[PDB]
Design a protein. Sequence first.
Length: 113
Amino acid sequence: ECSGNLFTQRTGTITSPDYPNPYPKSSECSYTIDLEEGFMVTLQFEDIFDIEDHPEVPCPYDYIKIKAGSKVWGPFCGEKSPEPISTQSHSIQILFRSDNSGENRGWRLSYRA
Ligand SMILES: [Ca+2]
C-alpha cells in the first residue's frame, strides 16, 4: 500500500518503496504535491534510477509518470535518469506502477518550490 501520499511542504525527497532495494511487485504508488497557486514545483531525479524496461516496447512493465495540469512527463523506465522537470505548477501528481516480476532498485526524486 503506497497510494494517496499528500505533501504540502515546499521541499521534499520521495522514493519508490524500499529504495534503493528492489521495489515491491504489483506496486501502485501515488504522491501528490499540493502547494498554494503561484508556487512552481521543480523536480530532479537523484542517485540510482533503475526501473524495469523492454528492448522493443516503451515501458510496458513498470514506470513512473508525472502529471501537472494538462502536462504529462513520462512514462519513464530503464536505467537513465530522467532530466529535471520545471513543472510550472503548484499541483503535481507522481504515479508509479510495477508488474508482478523482476528486480530493480527504483527511483529517488527531490522537489522544491
Ligand atoms: Ca517489474
